[model samples]
Target chain A: GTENLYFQSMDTTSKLALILADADLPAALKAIALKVQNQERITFDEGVYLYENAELGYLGVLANYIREQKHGDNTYFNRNFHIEPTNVCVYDCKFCSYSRLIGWEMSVDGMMEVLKKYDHEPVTEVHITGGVVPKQNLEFYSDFFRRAKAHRPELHIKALTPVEYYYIFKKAKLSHYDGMKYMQEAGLDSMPGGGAEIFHPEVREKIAHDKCNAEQWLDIHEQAHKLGMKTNATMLYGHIEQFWHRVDHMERLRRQQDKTGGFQAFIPLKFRNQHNQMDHVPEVSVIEDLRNYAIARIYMDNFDHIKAYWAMISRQTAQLSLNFGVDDIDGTLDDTTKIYSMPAMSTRDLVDLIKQVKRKPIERDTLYNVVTDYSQVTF
Target chain B: GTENLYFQSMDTTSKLALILADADLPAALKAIALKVQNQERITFDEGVYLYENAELGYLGVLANYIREQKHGDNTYFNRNFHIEPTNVCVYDCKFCSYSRLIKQKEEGWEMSVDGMMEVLKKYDHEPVTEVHITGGVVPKQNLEFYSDFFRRAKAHRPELHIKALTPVEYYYIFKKAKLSHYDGMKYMQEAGLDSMPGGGAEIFHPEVREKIAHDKCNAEQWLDIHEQAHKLGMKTNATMLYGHIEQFWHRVDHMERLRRQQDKTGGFQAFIPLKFRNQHNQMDHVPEVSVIEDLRNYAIARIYMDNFDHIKAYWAMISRQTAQLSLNFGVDDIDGTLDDTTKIYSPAMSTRDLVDLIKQVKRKPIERDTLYNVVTDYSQVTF
Candidate 1:
């Protein structure tokens, strides 16, 4: 009956009166707006419609509405260090800018030397992912995880991409669940979402062909989630793919999130085409990056957080993305962190950068639990 | 009383139904949507708020409303060709990959007026509408070269639009001809110059201009030349070369200057965001911005440069999908259907393919002239 009144009034003197009073919005948009205002789940078709039709401002408003409803005016960051144990990998992904065969190899003792710097500091997590070394498989990681926890039991060990886990598990002759259980037993806190390039077979087959296929990557993460572990998700975009590919990639992640309910954040990695096999491909512009963020936020309704991996896109864009539905500016790493795309800011600079955007920067653990609220309490 | 009910009911029952329906729409967004629905001009702060606040759905809804208001579902493209008279330029822009110097001297370059005529002859019956002529700063080929070339081309194809010459080219030729900006423009206009192309306005900020393209035209001089062209009843487009050593505020300031120029002359037809491609250039150290930057620049250009009639995504730089996606990002034009050579700029898509691409995105594609006159309703024809 209420719907009937809305449509009837939408057409008659009442609608005209609303128009006269300058309050009536576009009927289609108002319907969606009313749906969003009522806390409804916009269907995938509606999400696609929003991507195709919604205005940038209203899109941000909608994403920000949900953002505020979820995180609420407080953006998140964490102080962590990356441990690239070895740059030696067996599989060759074409879009990689920062890995080599058997180079910059660090032992657990060398990693300990790296961790000595953050000993007395507020570092909460150690992000460990690198080239999948052949011989250094499950035992190597389990020993490292054990030693790292033995040093600092409270320090969260957010290590290994799903592909790395798959590679290691293959070497260890274990299933995904058993591999994740082994690592969890060795103090592996969580998993980082990497190697899930465009999940569609047509695109994924080209970029990360030798790496674990999309099903395998998801299975490992799903198994990790089933083991009561939280993991992040990622999509490497802007290479030899269409917009539909991006939508399909996110839809897959959305499906996985729906099933597992253990994904913490979604990070869209911009494919940087320098010194790599994909050098013929140019970088996507800032506009595409921002749209990807807004689209990811709007599409992945089941996911709670969307992260701006500041190292890939510039920190400025990540800062501007605060209004564009990015809640977490992914961690802070000192010089020891070596992704080929150099992060543009240091730890102190990032914290100040967050504050400069008028967002309360709350330092977080790997799981997004608050470590310190810089908005109120000083470091 | 109706207004009172809007505010009161917006605060209470009706707003909550809109809100409590859990649509995730903000109050500010609802107000802006109402304004957009009424064809009202959202304030600059409101635009910023829209940038800072509106979610993808609501932002697109608002932008699409204004877009539908201005041009309906119809999107614009043109059939144009570029004629580079010479690759030998006097000025050395650090970001230029398309130019060479006479001193550094390569081979098989510099198209003569007759050579340009041959290129035009090649495209005689190919549905070409505009011939865009821009080349290096060859001091020898000044006013007479442009005049003779434009006259010969126009004599050959009187129906074709001669959209050529940047403001810098105008400044260069006016000085070369020993005449004022108006007279030089008059000379070109009389010789069949129909419009100007917006290039060489790299970034309006002096800090950036001085560094990357100091020898080229200054921002004020560029605007003044366009203003002079507008005074002569010529319409020109605008552009900004971004993603290389520029700040967010610098981009905002650049658009604001163009916005202010449009306010005065109202002669600007479209705003094109040129993504800086870093390859085999002096500034190769500067990485090109990802697609994120390109789309944001386009979206911001659409929202901020409100006075400009169109925002063009030159598919030459941003790929076809980016261009198609641009329809939602406040871009109404996908530039022209160039001959195959533009593949160097972007992945080549043919005219039929371009039309099909536009249709795939649910926008009606129309082939427009240089002055934006409808040449053909492409939507009527089956691709």
Candidate 2:
């Protein structure tokens, strides 16, 4: 029916009005505004300026309009659960509140038991990550991946960051390509975006000083893409980092995406001051949380989607972020997060929050394959 | 001293890198970015573009940067308590949640000196700098009652800054007492009224104001009362109730009138763009604007009202997080409230939590007096 043509055009009219009104705007912001309107990519420094200057209303309007063009009201989430095999870690990263040198460890049989527990839960994916330990080396993950897939063959095995793989490959003395191929063959379907905190060595050295260096992290994902596997990218923001540091970090990710097109999404992780060495750092305001998301969408024009952990950022900030720049609300998989359980946020609450913000909540699999669009249908 | 010199240069190197990195940014956004970094005022239409197109990230950068320049990492608030003379208003405002007309007085209550004195006494142990008094109208609790209350209040606590009444209340109070605007303000000053709180200026446009609130005082009476208070050497804040029935330009028109008045009197210390809530009132059918609008309105008010010294996001009205977010979006103060009293805005918070909220957001909690003079600066403490 031609019923929606008028409604669509009113939206068009509003955008045109916004475009026409740009003559009065300041030259720098006007350029970016037009870039966003024209569906052109904004430059790095201009994104920094946006962080320094653009108003929430202005950013929100343009960001919402762009999402309107890119994905419409369709906001993507996923059905999944976390299966952290260990809480133990070899590397000490200061920004981490979850990592510790020694903690509980689960055997492949135990992890399989956790997987079987979710058999009745209707989840399409299992997130496997946590710490790196020599005991649970390469074969351990491969064995678990094989067994979980054997039990529930349809489930997607999205597991571990390069941080875990680099050490595992190093300790196992296997080539990166062979290591990834071995897991993929043993039912590893995709890679979850983690481990790449900040690319700038100035901050990486201070905040991490360990894990896997930048290239190793990128190459691991690069190798994943080469194998026809998709991965996502994340940046730990709102800490002792500058605007330029953030931009610089994204630029590197942008270049990799340009080269490989392997990155499925760019998730901006917010640094929280929970009993960690970074406790001296104040948590960034919700406004900054939103601003960062909006700029990520505007600047990362090459990227396909922007995602946030709804449970990680407060539900209010998460819902408000749809207009800013986020499209994917990840992590409904766990009733809690990786290690310790967080303030309780349920699947019903997730869908309701997204719907309350006028977004269509769609359940997606690990590959971002749409499982269900809960727009017209109710919970 | 030289130690900080290099430390500061590093920030510039970082910022310069950001500015120089813009050759790749789209042409239009770059220009506005330049103007903002240069600290130029965005035009009226530019401000509107901010509403329609500016990304939250971009807007935040500029607003927080501008505010940082204007007030540093310092955010302002005051320790204040409310004193409602009465909720028995003569005028029936459609958007009101706190008032009851004379016939509906059973639900409403009137105020007395002793009753209000109790509120003042409760705060005696705390370091509260201001006592805020405003409410609906009733014939008995007019000028004499307020004067007597204020007189006794100041007698009890000589340092208390008595910020009381609104144009809506003042209009009736003066008319009932048979006094001129200038004369009525003089009486208030003599009776210890330190300043005026901005209220009752719902919307400057008659088309909108007449619909939400028909009688009481027109735009001029409200403006005239404020101007008179300004003339009497007392400062007052100006507020506009928005987000209900008013158009965007209606808000602009309201602000424009306040700007003009500020130009003449130079007495409007702050501009509060109060969001109209649709709860238990005549306009209950209207939906409250989204949190985005709350933030956008705060941003536009900051960008447009260049003369007004401060912008407030009343925490009681717009949830705490919204108020917290407003800090980066052109708001400098989350107006203090000790009770959920105001039928207009709502909430109540402990002093520690108030400081905790401001501190948690990476801003300094500067407990200020009525005039924004510092009393306590929680500049370095947080959990």
Candidate 3:
């Protein structure tokens, strides 16, 4: 009965109990299975243990159980557009391909022109983040947020990570709380989950340097959270980090979310080696990427949602990750973001991708409030 | 306050609990480990699973826990002697290196009932508690021949425990005399057949048995004969010829049948997992399992055959090195010197050798009689 089982019901509580009843299952596997079913908090050691030993099939069961428990059959995507403010980054990250000394910087009027171009479109959120250079200081972003909101006052301005703000706030001589307050009043609605890569120093110092450490990035989010701005977080995994480092990164995020309760989602971004300098380091298997998603879903029990970047991985992998505990396959972008793969995703593709996975297509805003339920929409 | 990590106390219960707490341990292994520490019986499928996946180190920890719980730090051996009535056989079972067919009877030897009596008389005044007898089956070496020997040997040494004859010999002689299995076993029991030594049980399944040894009594008849002996108030031992043409399922099925019968009558005393050594056997092309598999098999035996009172191996035949290694793995008793004349370190270890082997492995050496009556303890012996 179990071999060909594709879960027909959302009852993981009783479903897992039934799987645990098989006498031939290994004991340690059974023990962890019980831990997942019993709603017990798995220890940090158990988290690492799951990554090391748990098969993707077993982890998928536990992850989908948590997924259905949190969001039923609803899979979330967003109708959004991206605008890279500049490609000139001050800090050097070894894994990035977008940030270079190119003459590709966009000015405030340049971004305003693109914001006016999307005025007639049905998009709800304007997603913005790019390399950190001194040209885009606190005043530059405040002027951009102010003019964008003045042009279209209802548009949700989801803007920059701490990597940009850490430079701007340090150069502008402002506390994190005051600086985030300055952008919030200038109509910055939320922060994206970038700049928070692997939080442990063993990997963070190797691939990424000097924009911000884990604490500075986390403290920036906390200060934004103190201003009551709900944000998101992410981990750039599948590189030189070990399994323990992955769990270590999530454990740090779990603790931060535990305090602020303002972190909306946790995204595990796969490491893409397309045009990056870390080409010597081999990318992990696609199976490892899904396993990481499953573990992230299983471990981040206190967090509300686990996300996967659809264009960052692939359409098929993003669809497969839905049952591996991913609720939000973030955003429809038309190659405006140059940080990762510049794939052309439209609202029709995003909603159809969610629908093809047998999940209800939900178009959520930056804070994940339902903007549209495309469940009955034919397109 | 604790200077040394060495535990002065014997607490495997708590010790195993701490080992299970390691997160790096496999979950299935951890579960079986918990079962071992809690003294829970492993299921039949888990028994086969243990042989398939459980590493020797992990099985050693579990087996050592059970061993110490049953016989704390005590490794058992005994003083015994063996006799064979005939090597000339009417049957042509091919796994045999000892037996010769009637056509080649010149190469084999046959001892008369009076000849077995002579061997018993030689060990009569010796300090051995039992006399073990097994050999080839022939029409002339019939029920009457062994009856005379059992009765004569008991009359001469009234206190000697007589473990005589396998079901192969008994099955043939009884068939020759037109006797039923129960009546035949009853006749031997009353004629002073104290217990049955484990042999003629090469492999229980017909698939492997028909190829290696197709001529002997089948699996059902061998277990039936043992059950008849058990019902007649006689205790017996069991054996399986491993590392031969048997799959792992064949081994479990063999032990499962024995365990079921043991559950019924409680007649089986010990289980001997005999190694298939191809020095000069009929199936010489078949390779032997390595010492690693041997140690693993013994550990699995102790882990699987929970109902059997003891797990045993022939030391000199399996090798004195592996025999010493197995003291920690699951084998509690190494067969005493019947191998007395058997071919290992002369196939027989001196009492000092068995004692020194046990002590060298950090266990106390115990000398046992045939029925596990403790004859002596050598842990305190200076030499």
Candidate 4:
């Protein structure tokens, strides 16, 4: 019995072995189950354990459990896409890969057309952000949001970041507080968590800087929350960003959350230092990504949900993220969610997004009612 | 002009194969298609590709389209259990796994009136919520057997949700008890049949049924029984048993019929992709299921059973890890908390622990009722 307890303690492998044994599982795969049953909770080490020993099956079991807990008979997805604003920027931060020089044939028309296209599609949420151009800051954004808001009334215009706001305010001569007030008024329903690159400067500089040093980004976001608009937060972890840096990002976000209650989710954006301007930088491995996801879940402890973006991390790794304590996954899109991907120079498949959400064994992916027998919805 | 437009861009493979082929097509893969003036959306490749490709089956097309549209990143699963109440079922379908001939002594054993009570003794003492029940169709055992079993199971483990019986099982006994399906379900409802499972639905096709378990309910009866159950405001799951003698068309027919039934009942909460295990089957000549078949069937089921809420994966038959991989194809539930006390999935199962089952799947184990509602989140389970 105590040995049984030890097997249970070892993690998923042993636990499943015991479960299968208890389920009177056939003897066919007990050996494989025994090894898997002995594995400790889905840690990278345990994952690596199963990987070398068992194969893709381990990933599948973890993926299945993760999908079920997150959605629970409901695989939620939405018809949406991304619209990153101007690529022109004020802060030529070190990890700045997407931000183009102001003189780079200012494609304002290209962006305007993109927004117009976003307006026409059967899109529910339009992510309007990017290319933080301080020379023409919040005034540009205010007009952008105002026009976009006027363009589509029902569209959930999730836009901007405090870093974008901080630069825009400096450029347009407005207070950070006042700028948030105006954007919220202009139908910016929520804000996407983009530029919180690294919570620590040494690391942030090594990645992306002059964007928003940890404190500036935090302050700007807190100010927005004071205005009552929901905002998401993210960290560019696992490049040169230290483990402590990752923890620090969660701590700071948690503190802000404690104060503002505005952080809808703490999205851990996987570092793509490769191909971006920081080409020489070595990207993080599968283990580090899993570690970071698990650490965030364990450390944040207070956040409602820890979201894993599929664009940066592959679907296989994203499936692993569930065991690491991730709940909410990113959404589905009709067109490309290219702003973060191409800029980060990441390679994530768009279709896998809808598949992954629905793949969550329980069904509730994003749209909670997608599969909830509405007839059961009494109210 | 359209044909000329097509021929202007045909590849080398097609150019040799056909004089005037479509211009925009890759020559090698589209050689056959290019030859035809009217091609069927360029259906190329077979097996995994054909199943997953958009050109052929809608399941592959939707899976491709949905996967292309959404997750760009991750999939998820949960920690739950499959707690079969008592293996003393009334029917002995040809494909039965756990239920046995009562005369087989050790092989053929039914939990006694007290045996059922004692079987759940561990759950009663511990924290567990959902109890899934299915067993042999014992002619002697009727609605009262399940009713009494549920009343006691609930009394012992008050928080536990009782998802019991396949609709066919209910049909057999209800028709025997001389009561309407409604009255039988209501009797169990009073005793605590929180929800029903999608079992005994071997194959909805009449020809397939005629070959396997003909004595069982016909397709219409199976659909009608569930329809009545759904009309009672009760939720039930539907299943398709594939990988046997059933052809691809048969499998499609099975799903289409259920989808139609679902259209009427809306009570079908989930469509389970039940892989027909080839252990001790009368029809052993059929090749055992390949991994490709498993994935294709699941992906296709997810695409086909778009009406059903979830595509529940049974790790018992597929192994826990392969079931996890099913998440990628479009599986929702891993069928957690399997206390091996099941007869249908396995002939002889040992007792599995609910808490242990939760950790096995790496989910914050929660005790859900027959209704798929969470009763206890295992993350908070303290010493």
Candidate 5:
């Protein structure tokens, strides 16, 4: 009887109230919200709550809401490629599943191959990351970016994790600001959110003892932010961290965000505890995954976007997080990611991944200029 | 070939280096001679680095290692019954799913002998470990109703451990007792109340209260009530609500309160974090909780509440799936089981029970008696 009352009241009142309230919203947006909300079969509050509480799903509505309120269908999806310039590093951090010894052989001409591929396709953004090989040097990356851009001048090369940047800066005997400026002149666009496994030293020391501590990572990122470079931050959860540590990390990120307005997005990489050294550690379940997204949304209030990586989470789960507060499903890619797959064991899709996500693929130029928003054409 | 190098170096040399070097040691704990060598993980140089860096996980592991060494695998989780003495609340808050106006006869259900009896039936013939009484403040079901309900619940099962009265509920109950917090707690103890459930503790949160639930109880009052309960020799659990519209500072604030209160009274037994579920409520668009966030929350709670012994995951709220996941994420307890009929906060839960929740998670589920002593180890039980 009580369940029936709850259902009846929920169906007639709350559902109608949301629908009626949403009627004032634009028909196109409202219609999309209604469709996604209905398909997900959650109340408007649940939509908000899930948007607030869970991660993944109910995307079209939340994205539409944000589009209507803020940007208007201009949810920026970058056409970036993940280029691991080198997997060779010095640190043997326990949390690390992908890293090679400094002299280990890597994909020969991989950087050139990547540049050649970007030349063929109008791929705009290239995110370069990898092992902190001390010998790789600033000139290696700066020259790589300069040479690559010679082919495609418009290509936005986003290279180096904080480890790479920090070490590279020290090796070249340059300040972070000077190094970033040099890289910017050499056509380096931005930095990836990787290497920020946990910005708290307690966790970092236990798992990644040899790597730069949380402060050093933040200092490098802050310096990059001070320069005209856009960057992303991430927290690799499901290993062993505390609530306060997550809080400390988020607050610290928010503080940096408040200061530099540098954080473009907050990505919480779900721990895929596979055959890596931390195999005994169980991976985060789907609910926990959603919770992580929700908490990120709730905690990182200063951040404009909370992103779910389909590479890390399933497309469906990532899609579900749209309701949970994720405004963007990081765009489609071809065989761009390597390290995250081999040992990280992340999900990969080569097809019209972004277009597939939006349910309509729009091929945009490297600078987010619309190439075409294609309809389902029947030839 | 490359994989072999990683494994070979990982196990024999690097592994020994990590252990012998003691990479997990906190800066304060590392010895000076080894620290001077800079050969150890927590060497003087590394200690300086750690001081500058502030790795919470390293500190947490070091502390957790000590806690484990001191306490062993013998962590404690109490078997307690949660009784909401009232749900007819006047506060029409946006984020709350449990409140109802008394005039809304069409909506609300007041707990009576039949209502309370049905709730009480779960603790039937079997020894009820603890009956935790709490509820929405109904003007009709005032202090008399609550104290009487506890008296009657004790009348039914005299040995049923009663751990009731959240701060707000206690404040209301105290209004009836016409006594101080200590005096009120004493009266309740005389009336068969054994401890207190640390629910309704949004604590002294500015942002959270402003956005979601403002009127429940102030920060100091929540602490004082627990402090009173502690003075009365009553154990209590504390909660930090997350995934709501609260900031990171609010989380730190809530944790600091628990740590401080424990310092004063030593009453707080466990830190049960209520991971907000996105259900029927106004602030619904707000993303609830994430697993990463939840794990981080539990891990952080474990590290921060160094004084508190247990870190509990509300399996019912997070689900049986997350119950196991939380265990690896620094949580010691995966809350209790209640068959259907648990309808106050989260009505939309699975009818399928979580009897196998512990065993399924690879942990030995030992059913303990009232005092947290193992009467029967479920690990040895035949399915």
Candidate 6:
């Protein structure tokens, strides 16, 4: 029937249409699914229509088809430790539960102690994020980076959000390129996607108004991409934003990813409403969260991967998302990563959780290069 | 060529196997999916295995298959208002955010019969079809208070669907009045108590009930009251409060008990999975169930509670978004619109909001009576 080779050179939309036809989906929605199957980009109105009218189970069929096309049941994870240098930040984001106006800063001695724990361990990356410590400047990060490299040069320094980069570069009166250059030379490997709250100004202005605006956040990541450095992008959803805003956020990231081809992963941060100013906003249900993941994977075609930050959403949802188009469940975030005050699973539990889902849990480095494929291991 | 009819009269396990094969699902889990597809009941170990070992997407396939089979994209909701008589209570539950002791009961806290009328008057013109009344078991106000209130409410609005009280309260009344549970239910029904609101069923497991609400009626007493009500041909709803101290096995046992009871009675209407709210409670230390766990509970309840017709995700407690998403996960109903007075659960949504939320999730919202008789199909009326 030539069906086995249907996707060999076929576009995503056509592949999806064929699958939808095979599944005998409802006729009206299947018409729209045919357009997407034809590789035609869905319109804004159509996206909204699908969001509102698509059958829940049918949505899973298309999303899963696209997901299996991109990643054939191979889920990704990494063993990384988080280092929040300080919680003191200048900008006040209403939805941020991690940062404080006044907080303790981790000294070099203390940080080294934390870093040493991961030195001989199987850790491949050190994730660095902190508030914009007003007094700390470019040299502060450069010095930390130099020392971290001296300690474990093999560790991938996936440090700083674009917001942090802007703060440091703005403080130093240096260009974004120079700022990234300084850190990259000192062993900054890639950027962690944290502060791209929402690309839609209507949402960004409310939840993260004082932080970097959408344009500024995108600009910093663009400069990093220009320097041939890999960076991640994120969108904090389920706050005051509507469904259209979520699609807009992913579209903007898709455009940037298309231009630069440098976004390693797109992580969608689910909003947690505890001990935060925006506490009135309820956490999205697992259904909405999974739909968001599936939609993001389908829309962000230029992006290679979509990650479910398991720490924010429970491991249970993250595990469930493996079937919903999510390829990466962030990493083995040790307890030291206290940015969100979230519940976390141990590394052993994390590996077992992935194994339990029947996906090949591959340990990856920061850039997503394979470290070890647990498929070879005998459980 | 004949694959199109593969699911026509096929068992759930074979259908699941077909879908899993098309999905290119791993071989290790296909056997379990087959068992589920074949309508062969799985044990606790298999349940745990499916929860743990099944692919995330494959689980969705099986669950959604079962869901679509029962009620294909038809989500249910009702236009009901909550009417609490008082918060003064005889027993204290750690997870209860509503009730209080007799000493701390505020002056005029207990509503007089006229006050209950005021609560009714507030919703008089709201187009609501049902009035759900349940509250603390004040000793002096045993069966008499409920009977008088139900009789008065029925007199005022004869068409109003009155669903009030739980099995625990019935047990309390039976013990206080020294009558059989049958007599207590009979008095309430004669006084216009339409059906029962499932509460105080908490976790039916002794390990859970003993610690959470020890003074509350035991499992047998609670079940006995509901069984007696079923014997009288009265329908009721069931509830399980999870993500507290109970394990997954505890939840399984709770649902199994309800399934067994439903098998005998065939009178249960819906199953509501209550997520424990940690704020302002004695069990505040226990974390709220993650939305993931909440959805999982709903999916499992729909799969396991085979005889139960509807599974409700109370929007007030689980939030509107989750409730809407629950339509796909074996939930057919999002309980009702409660005005701000129901502080026991937060996130009170309006009727228009509920209708719009359901429509947005692509489910047809039908307003129904306490007995699930159709009051209105909001889709045709509004849209």
Report every candidate's CA lDDT.
Answer: 0.74, 0.78, 0.80, 0.58, 0.61, 0.74
Residue-wise C-alpha lDDT for candidate 4, range B1-383, written one tens digit per residue? 12332322232223334433336544443443232223222222322233434232223233423332332212223333454444544444556554243223345555555666676675654445566677666665577777787888778777777777776677788988898877777788888778787887889888788876677678887887788778778888888887877767677778778877887778887778777765664555667777657766776666556567667776567754565445545564556453444457633222234344444433344444454466555555664
TM-score (0 to 1) of chain B, per candidate? 0.84, 0.86, 0.91, 0.71, 0.77, 0.86
Off by over 4 Å in 3: A1-379, B1-11, B99-103, B338-348
Better of 4 and 5 by DockQ: 4
TM-score of model 4 vs. true structure: 0.44
RMSD values for the candidates in order, in angstroms, are 25.6, 22.3, 19.6, 15.7, 24.7, 23.9
Clashes of 4: 80
lDDT digits (tens) for residues B279-373 of candidate 3: 65577788888888887888888877888879887876766667777777788888857333435573347777777667765678888876666
For model 6, the superposed segments whose C-alpha errors exceed 4 Å read A1-379, B1-15, B22-32, B51-56, B99-103, B338-348, B371-375, B380-383
Q: lDDT tens string, model 5, A174-249? A: 9878888898888787887878887788788777777777787888888888887788898888778865566667
| Candidate 1, CAPRI quality class derived from DockQ | incorrect
TM-score per model over all chains? 0.46, 0.49, 0.49, 0.44, 0.43, 0.49
True contacts kept of each: 0.00, 0.00, 0.00, 0.09, 0.00, 0.00
DockQ-based CAPRI category assigned to the predicted complex of candidate 4 = incorrect
The TM-score obtained by chain A of candidate 5 when compared with the true chain A:
0.73
Error of 2 at B219 (Å): 31
- Tens-digit lDDT track of model 6 for A298-359: 67767778888777766567777776678888756453545766555665667666765557
Off by over 4 Å in 4: A1-75, A99-112, A319-324, A335-379, B1-383
lDDT of 5 by residue, B295-358 (tens): 5566556655667777777766765445655554457655654444545874322213343545
Quote the lDDT for A54 in model 4: 37
Q: Between candidates 4 and 6, name the one with more favorable DockQ.
A: 4
On DockQ, the candidate that comes out on top is 4
